[PDB]
Design a protein around this ligand. Structure first.
Ligand SMILES: CC(C)[C@H](N)C(=O)N1CCC(c2nc(-c3cccs3)no2)CC1
Ligand SMILES: CC(C)[C@H](N)C(=O)N1CCC(c2nc(-c3cccs3)no2)CC1
Lengths: 193, 193
């Protein structure tokens, strides 16, 4: 049932708005999707697999959007171009705050969640490194740090800063200031001597 | 028993090198400290309180070292000065990797751990913001982003980058490259137009 699986995922994202995964039971997901507990278990082996699927969907949505942008870059200056790409993650994770938050909490306890996050961060960092490489090859960025190490810290910064902001952690940058903040630190560190 | 409590904390830090807190039992801490289980419970209510005390000790050690440096700044240029301060956290958390790692895992499940981390990050970010303010007042740094928002992202970057490095996460900057990486991104973003 494409619909029954989707109903489960929809309920899980809705419930995660209100509590952590530890406080949502399989019976809760089933009730919300209009199904029995054993029917639930035909579609997912555990409420953890539900979170893993929700996170996979969000990570691929962000990845697909970055691939589109990479094929269709904005015709504007460097700063606004980097803003556009960082915005892909700001708007994609920011429209799925509860999934994002729960997926991060899970990295500690779930090998598959951890792996899924790893895989995509590796990809995103390799792409950032290749852009910085191209920028250096064009003579637009100086050859300062190793591009992949610079890319790794800047992507890590974005991961921690975006997610603190969407969780309203203390300390955090306000959500309405976070793009400006990250784009400044990316531009100054990639183009600065 | 100042010694019995210390023996408990020493065992916990030693065991956390090998497994997560979830796989260390109260009986394990007691055996390692040469005490019985109920004696253990006279000193700490739970193995979680042991981790909280271990983390408090590490956070205060880092905070005290930064306060010393702030009173006794290095006589060298801006870059090397910022390197010295970031190094306080590199060497302090880096000499307590297992406590650091477990303390981060715990932020998700423990209000007190979360609070303790928050308190100190707030302090460290306020201090960074005040240095950037002073640098702008001296005319050495330009007035670009709000200093406290810049300080917050750069401290968050350090938190996530240092801890990925010490955990050998994939992706991470190699531990032997992380100071250079962070100091470049701090200097370029604080002094760059
Ligand atoms: C950004 C400039 C150098 C390039 N001309 C361009 O427009 N694009 C390549 C960079 C790309 C981008 N990626 C990213 C991110 C990758 C990882 C986190 S943010 N941010 O912007 C946007 C499109
Ligand atoms: C750094 C310059 C502007 C100042 N003259 C100085 O030497 N100090 C103030 C900054 C201080 C410092 N703090 C930090 C960090 C604070 C938070 C994370 S790192 N890094 O360096 C070192 C001493």
């Amino acid at each position: 049932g494409d619909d029954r699986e989707l109903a489960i995922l929809a309920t899980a994202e809705n419930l995660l708005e209100d509590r952590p995964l530890a406080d949502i039971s399989v019976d809760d997901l089933a009730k919300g999707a209009g199904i029995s507990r054993p029917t639930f278990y035909f579609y997912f082996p555990s409420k953890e697999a539900v979170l893993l699927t929700l996170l996979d969907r969000v990570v691929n949505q962000a990845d697909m959007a970055l691939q589109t942008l990479a094929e269709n870059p904005a015709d504007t200056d460097r700063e606004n171009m980097w803003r556009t790409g960082i915005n892909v993650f700001f708007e994609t994770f920011g429209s799925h705050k509860a999934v994002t938050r729960a997926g991060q909490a899970a990295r500690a306890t779930s090998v598959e969640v951890a792996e899924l996050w790893s895989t995509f961060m590796q990809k995103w960092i390799a792409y950032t490194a290749a852009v910085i490489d191209a920028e250096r090859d064009r003579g637009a960025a100086p050859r300062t740090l190793p591009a992949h190490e610079l890319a790794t810290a800047l992507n890590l910064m974005n991961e921690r800063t975006l997610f603190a902001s969407f969780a309203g952690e203390q300390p955090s940058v306000p959500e309405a200031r976070v793009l400006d903040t990250l784009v400044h630190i990316w531009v100054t560190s990639i183009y600065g001597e």
